[PDB]
């Protein structure tokens, strides 16, 4: 039948791509960075601790000013923090308590949140009256909202559990672009330094690079063994790191179209929940289910430090735009700032 | 110069904190419940007693219960089921090979590393339907389970005067299938509360209320290292 013909036509195309990638693997990243000096032991300490939330924190996002950050806990609250003074700037009661993601607009005027309600709600923080009201509700996803990221005040890309990513247009509430390549639940997404491309990681152990404007899947990155939970672009925009349930982090290169480095240890058997780079991309911070956050040498694949302050599963972690501090969220209601 | 902002920011922070203490009183007073059931099971019939999740609020003896139905979601639960790791109990509605598929789903919920402290309330909601097919020749419980011919009614069984001894043996065999998974991995962290539902009784919220009271009691006994 033609179904077996399409499977055979796809099976050989998989061999054509696999052999084209092997031809480019002339030297690994561990061989190019063999003579560089190690970064040494990284010892960060908990500078701040945020204790406002009443339940497990699922997501957090820094503002572009590196001072304000928004967190999302499943108690039904969206709290905006002043990391310097530890004060709470806003507390937003959510209609649905099962929030799974939160985002901060680069202009600092709006915040987004989504979860099991299958809605991406936008909250205006700069209203004339002063109070924070829900400005828009984006409906159309047939699965839970996993991640959302503002491109600007009027555009936002969302990943959902319906195996689909969507590019929304605020002020109209309509999907302008739909990304349907993935076969499993998309769990994370990361915008490049420019807002023209973004990567997504789904539960099919695969990562896909998307063009925002054209709505096409340019490249597909495999190599993981289990569900990809986290993803983050390199500061230069030519690579990205993924975190999966196979207890490993992997570095993929866009131009090389293959995996470059694997960050794993035998003493690590828990999944990775969050990944983030430094301002220079030399360090790779990953949150684990063992209540700790390991700091990896992105160029040498050697653990450079441990962030063990949290008492429960580290759900989220984010680095400021100036690389000055690292915020980590946990399934304990507390959020810790590291430096 | 900047003391005007650092004081106005500390005033709004205290206004936020006084509101969060009113939320902490409401959030900790209500008990959250996860309603989990297949398609054939009468899951919506339990609610008697599009949206990505359905919320129903009821009150039993001045105690607030917030039950959540997971609708408009795909059958891949391994990612969003981790959100319900702090609920009081997971309501598991089973229809009495849909029975084997429910035994595997309860096995995955029971042995999940994030749901191993979450108790499970079990409801077999097709007792009236099971009572018609067991005494007839279309029960289909002997071919799907060959160890049923070797099974006898337990001594702890409570046979009602309106059910035949075969349905009593049949419904207690299905209950022993779910209790076999609970006893193999139960180490005092979470428990299973199986109940028989004939879908004609409105006393199911009294069973949830009584089972959630046993869960909170066992959680308090565990904090004092008494149980």
């Amino acid at each position: 039948s033609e179904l077996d013909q399409l499977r055979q036509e796809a099976e050989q195309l998989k061999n054509q791509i696999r052999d084209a990638r092997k031809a480019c693997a002339d030297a690994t990243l561990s061989q190019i960075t063999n003579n560089i000096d190690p970064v040494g032991r990284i010892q960060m300490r908990t500078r701040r601790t945020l204790r406002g939330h009443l339940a497990k924190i699922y997501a957090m996002h820094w503002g572009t000013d590196s001072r304000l950050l928004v967190s999302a806990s499943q108690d039904g609250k969206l709290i905006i923090w002043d990391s310097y003074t530890t004060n709470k700037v806003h507390a937003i009661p959510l209609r649905s308590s099962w929030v799974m993601t939160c985002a901060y607009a680069p202009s600092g005027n709006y915040v987004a949140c989504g979860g099991l309600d299958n809605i991406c709600s936008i909250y205006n923080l700069k209203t004339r009256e002063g109070n924070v009201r829900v400005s828009r509700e984006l409906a159309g996803h047939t699965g839970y909202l996993s991640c959302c990221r503002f491109l600007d005040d009027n555009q936002i890309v969302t990943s959902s559990g319906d195996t689909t990513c969507a590019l929304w247009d605020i002020e109209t509430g309509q999907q302008t672009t739909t990304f349907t390549g993935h076969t499993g639940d998309v769990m994370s997404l990361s915008l490049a330094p420019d807002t023209r491309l973004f990567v997504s990681g789904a539960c099919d152990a695969s990562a896909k690079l998307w063009d925002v404007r054209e709505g096409m899947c340019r490249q597909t990155f495999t190599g993981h063994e289990s569900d990809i939970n986290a993803i983050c672009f390199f500061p230069n925009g030519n690579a990205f790191a993924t975190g999966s349930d196979d207890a490993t982090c992997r570095l993929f290169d866009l131009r090389a179209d293959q995996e470059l480095m694997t960050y794993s240890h035998d003493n690590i058997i828990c999944g990775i929940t969050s990944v983030s780079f430094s301002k220079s991309g030399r360090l790779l911070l990953a949150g684990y289910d063992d209540f700790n956050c390991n700091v990896w040498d992105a160029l040498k694949a050697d653990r450079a430090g441990v962030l063990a302050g949290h008492d429960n599963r580290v759900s989220c972690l984010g680095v400021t735009d100036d690389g000055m501090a690292v915020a980590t969220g946990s399934w304990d209601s507390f959020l810790k700032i590291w430096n | 110069d900047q003391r005007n902002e650092e004081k106005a920011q500390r005033e709004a922070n205290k206004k936020i904190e006084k509101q969060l203490q009113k939320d902490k009183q409401v959030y900790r007073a209500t008990h959250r419940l996860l309603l989990l059931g297949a398609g054939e099971s009468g899951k919506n019939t339990i609610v008697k007693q599009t949206s990505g999740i359905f919320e129903t609020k009821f009150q039993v003896d001045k105690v607030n219960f917030h039950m959540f139905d997971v609708g408009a979601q795909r059958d891949e639960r391994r990612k969003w089921i981790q959100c319900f790791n702090d609920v009081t109990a997971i309501i598991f509605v089973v229809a009495s090979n849909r029975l084997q598929a429910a035994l595997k789903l309860f096995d995955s919920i029971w042995n999940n590393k994030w749901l191993r402290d979450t108790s499970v309330i079990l409801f077999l909601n097709k007792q009236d339907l099971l009572a018609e097919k067991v005494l007839a020749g279309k029960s289909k419980i002997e071919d799907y389970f060959p160890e049923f011919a070797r099974y006898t009614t337990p001594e702890d069984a409570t046979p009602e005067p309106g059910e035949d001894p075969r349905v009593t043996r049949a419904k207690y065999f299905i209950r022993d299938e779910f209790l076999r998974i609970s006893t193999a991995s139960g180490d005092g962290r979470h428990y299973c509360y199986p109940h028989f539902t004939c879908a004609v009784d409105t006393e199911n919220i009294r069973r949830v209320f009584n089972d959630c009271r046993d869960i909170i009691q066992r959680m308090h006994l565990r904090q004092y290292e008494l149980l």
Partner: nanobody, 128 residues
Framework: QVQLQESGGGLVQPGGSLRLSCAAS????????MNWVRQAPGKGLEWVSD????????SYTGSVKGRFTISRDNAKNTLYLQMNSLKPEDTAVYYC?????????????????????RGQGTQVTVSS
């Protein structure tokens, strides 16, 4: 690239025997629990059997208990299913399903309609 290709299968007469093979690649085969699932014509995906990471813990569905035998070879990264005394009710497409996370006792979503980490399946027809 997680890959699962099921070999074997074919047309068997009722009462015969057959051996299904599942070749795995792209992941540490010893760290994962493996499953067998089938889909009868006009029915949904039904769980058949599973086996632990080492091979000690083994479970079957009631219909095939005493007839089917599941075994794994971690050195060869292959899963087996010896199907004895086949009857026409066993006619289905048998899939090799791996549940997603390693070192986990729970084994989720193997019988989902659109589920990754599951092979394309092999046709097993029990006809006269």
């Amino acid at each position: 690239q997680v890959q699962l290709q099921e070999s074997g299968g074919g047309l068997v007469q009722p009462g015969g025997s057959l051996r299904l093979s599942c070749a795995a690649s792209g992941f540490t085969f010893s760290n994962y629990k493996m499953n067998w699932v089938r889909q009868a014509p006009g029915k949904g995906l039904e769980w058949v059997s599973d086996i632990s990471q080492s091979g000690a813990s083994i479970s079957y569905t009631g219909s095939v208990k005493g007839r089917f035998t599941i075994s794994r070879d971690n050195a060869k990264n292959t899963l087996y299913l010896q199907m004895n005394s086949l009857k026409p009710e066993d006619t289905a497409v048998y899939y090799c399903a791996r549940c997603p996370a390693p070192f986990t006792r729970d084994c989720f979503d193997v019988t989902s309609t659109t589920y990754a980490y599951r092979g394309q399946g092999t046709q097993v027809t029990v006809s006269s």
